[PDB]
Amino acid sequence: FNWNKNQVIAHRGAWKKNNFPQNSIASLNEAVKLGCYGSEFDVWMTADHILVVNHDPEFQGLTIEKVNYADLLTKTMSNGEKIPTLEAYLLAGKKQKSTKLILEIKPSLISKERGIEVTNKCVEMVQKLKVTDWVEYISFDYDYCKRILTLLPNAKVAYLKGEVSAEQMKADKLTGVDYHYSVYQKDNWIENAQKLGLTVNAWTVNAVPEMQWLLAHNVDYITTNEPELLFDEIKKAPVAQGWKLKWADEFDNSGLPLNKNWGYDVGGRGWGNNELQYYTDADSANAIVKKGNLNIIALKAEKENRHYTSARLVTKNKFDFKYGRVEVRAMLPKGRGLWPAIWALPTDSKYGSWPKSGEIDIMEHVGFDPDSVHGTVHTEKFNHVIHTQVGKALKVNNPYTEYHIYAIEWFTDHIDFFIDDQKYLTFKNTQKGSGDWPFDQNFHILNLAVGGNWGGKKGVDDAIFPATMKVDYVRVFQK
Ligand SMILES: OC[C@H]1O[C@@H](O[C@@H]2[C@@H](O)[C@H](O[C@@H]3[C@@H](O)[C@H](O)O[C@H](CO)[C@H]3O)O[C@H](CO)[C@H]2O)[C@H](O)[C@@H](O)[C@@H]1O
Ligand SMILES: OC[C@H]1O[C@@H](O[C@@H]2[C@@H](O)[C@H](O)O[C@H](CO)[C@H]2O)[C@H](O)[C@@H](O)[C@@H]1O
């Protein structure tokens, strides 16, 4: 066995790219060629009790469970293949020893006892063909999963349906959870299962954001119709370089930002830049999580001594860190007068107040200049008050209508800045002391300033409100 040790599972074989039929010998062999960890397929049983491979219960209009296999042979798939028998599928996979065969037993549309029998026959067929080492099982029917585990105690078995606790599954000796990916977008489903020793798979994951999300949280497998795109995404993901996720807010809660992750900076006293906004305290009008992302909303609204309200969220003393990859996926608010920022301040200010203990601006944008997004470091020697800050600006296509990934990678000796994995700035540790390099322990800040010394130079377009900065996630990786 030269098993492939990657996360790619080819949903119904590798069928889509080369226009093969789903759940076919062609699509399975293509999955072997690509080097997938596994190739996934679906099993039904004919009326005359022959196991065959097809997702739907009707193969070209014939109800599999109610017709003879001979009846199904009157139909031909797009590449000329007939409906494969399970035996033919398992023997084709037997001819190679690098990718697993992920067998799905479909719940019977006839009866639970029939489907338990299907399960009996599937396990017997794996044993008769001696391919027990290739085959791993998934099912929507919890009873079939447990029946497999009775017949094969060391079998790999994962459950697909979603409504059983990770704690119960480990009790019943299942080895993985395999839910639709939306299911995991509730509280710590992934970490929970891994804590208990279950592998984590997710199905059908065809789009890049969900791929990068599942990789960031280090799932074991991803079932996809886009295995070639997934290999590409694995190469460019932070785990490929040794980054491990330490902390994330995927903003999958609804309501106010989580108190375990975010505190509020509150007040309208200018924030050192003569800014025009009052940052409010736990007010859903300026900070709200909904539909999978954080909304920071600036409003043209009098409050106390200011004409605008907004929000400034900080992880100070909730998540503080030194070194790492900081990744924030964000869509910027449009309009002259706005000054959104994604940045970081030191938690303890070991060298004195700003700018002596530093600041890192992962993303700054002033709405009067739409074609520039900026990254900047500030130190005692290199800051904007004395006109010595070290920073660069990149033009970003469509900053207001699509998400972009604003990122830093922060090491003992330098900091790299990225916009959508384009590196555009490196700040090197000069090794001449803390006035040149104060970086030892910081936290994150998301805010939408209005006006101010930088952002207000050309006035505020009072028509742009309400103005929303959307943040898909904040992820912090470390080595
Ligand atoms: O601490 C006293 C010192 O405060 C200064 O106010 C600074 C702000 O200039 C500073 O501004 C931030 C940028 O430097 C940063 O890197 O980008 C962010 C986001 O866009 C800005 O908020 O913020 C710090 C920390 O809150 C303030 O202390 C005064 O300008 C200066 O006169 C005063 O001595
Ligand atoms: O004033 C706060 C901001 O200062 C910026 O430095 C430069 C500005 O002083 C100048 O007016 O605009 C240029 C644009 O290239 C800035 O680089 C910092 O870049 C910001 O981090 C800081 O918030």
Q: Which residues contact 304 (CB under 8 A, 6 or more apart)?
A: 268, 278
Cβ of 353 below 6 Å from ligand 1: yes
Distant-in-sequence, close-in-space partners of 387: CB < 8 Å, separation ≥ 6: none
List the resolution, Å.
Answer: 2.2
- Residue 300 burial class via C-beta count within 10 angstroms: exposed 0-12, middle 13-18, buried 19 and up: middle
Is 364 tagged catalytic? yes
State the Cα–Cα distance between residues 433 and 435, nearest whole angstrom: 6
Strand residue runs (E) in 306-399: 306-310, 312-314, 324-331, 338-346, 359-364, 373-378, 390-394
CA of 388 to the centre of ligand 1 (A): 14
Please tell me what DSSP assigns to residue 161: S
Residue 159 burial (CB count, 10 A)? 27
Tokens of 150: 């009775």
Ligand 1 centre and the CA of 79: distance in Å? 65
CA 264 to chain centre: 26
Mapped onto helix, strand or coil, the DSSP state of residue 321 is strand
Residue with tokens 């599954």: 169
The C-alpha atoms of residue 75 and residue 63 are separated, in whole angstroms, by 12
User: Does residue 23 come out as left (phi exceeding 0), alpha (psi in the -120 to 50 range) or beta?
Assistant: left
Contact 234, 215 (CB under 8 A): yes
DSSP lists the bridge partners of residue 158 as 138, 176
| C-alpha distance from residue 286 to each of 262, 269, 289, 334 (Å) | 14, 17, 10, 16
C-beta of 274 in contact with ligand 2 (< 6 A): no
**How far apart are the C-alpha atoms of 325 and 245, rounded to whole Å?**
9
Task: Kindly state if the Cβ of 359 falls inside 6 Å of ligand 1.
Answer: yes
List, as one string, the DSSP characters of 216-270.
HTT-S-EEES-HHHHHHHHHHSGGGGT-EEEEEE---S-BSPPTTT-EE--B-S-
The residue type found at 458 is: K
Mutate to test the pocket of ligand 1, among 273, 363, 406, 445 (most ligand atoms within 8 A of CB): 273
- 380 CB within 6 A, ligand 1: no
| Residue with token string 């030194």 | 322
Which residue of the set 30, 226, 359, 409 is catalytic? 359
Cβ distance 38 to 102 under 8 Å?
yes
Establish whether residue 349 lines the binding site of ligand 1, counting it when its CB lies within 6 angstroms of any ligand atom. no
d(CA 359, ligand 1 centre) in Å: 9
**Atom 5 in ligand 1: residue holding the nearest Cα:** 272
Q: Is the CB of 272 under 6 A from ligand 1?
A: yes
Helix residue ranges, H only, 222-340: 227-236
**183/300 Cα distance (integer angstroms):** 38
Q: How far apart are CA 127 and CA 133, in angstroms?
A: 10
Q: Rounded to the nearest whole angstrom, what is the distance from the C-alpha of residue 454 to the centroid of ligand 2?
A: 6
Atom of ligand 1 nearest to the CA of 445: 19
Distance 448 CA to ligand 2 centre (A): 16
**Of the residues 250, 364, 380, 409, which is catalytic?**
364
| CA of residue 154 relative to chain centroid, distance | 31
Domains of the chain: 8-249 (3.20.20.190), 263-478 (2.60.120.200)
Mutate which of 312, 387, 454, 458 for ligand 2 pocket (most atoms within 8 A of beta carbon): 454
Mode of pairing for the β-strands spanning 58-59 and 62-63: antiparallel
The set of residues, in sequence order, having a beta carbon less than 8 Å from that of 267 and lying 6+ positions away, is 278, 279
CB distance 341 to ligand 1 below 6 Å: yes
Q: Which ligand has its closest atom nearest to the C-alpha of 360?
A: 1
Question: Would you say 382 and 363 are in contact if contact means Cβ atoms under 8 Å apart?
Answer: no
In this structure, which amino acid lies at residue 371? D
Contact 369, 337 (CB under 8 A): no
The response to whether residue 365 sits with its C-beta less than 6 Å from ligand 2 reads: no
* CA–CA dist 315, 393 (Å, integer): 26
The pair of three-digit structure tokens given for residue 353, joined into one six-digit string: 């107040």
Q: Which atom number of ligand 1 is nearest to the Cα of residue 449?
A: 20
Cα–ligand 2 centroid distance for 384 (angstroms): 6
Q: Which atom of ligand 1 lies at the shortest distance from residue 447's CA?
A: 19
* 40 among known catalytic residues: no
- Residue with the smallest CA separation from ligand 2 atom 22 is 384
Among 313, 359, 372, say which to mutate for ligand 1: greatest number of ligand atoms within 8 Å of CB. 359
DSSP annotation of 189 reads H
CB neighbourhood size of 43 (10 A): 23
In ligand 2, the atom with minimum distance to the C-alpha of 361 is 21
**Joined tokens for residue 460:** 């505020």
Q: Whose CA is nearest to atom 1 of ligand 1?
A: 354
Q: Is 232 helix (H, G, I), strand (E, B) or coil?
A: helix
Rounded Cα–Cα distance for residues 230 and 10 (Å) = 10
Q: Is 21 exposed, middle or buried (0-12, 13-18, 19+ CB in 10 A)?
A: buried
Question: Quick check: 243 and 212 in contact, CB under 8 A?
Answer: no
Rg of the chain taking only CA atoms, in angstroms? 27
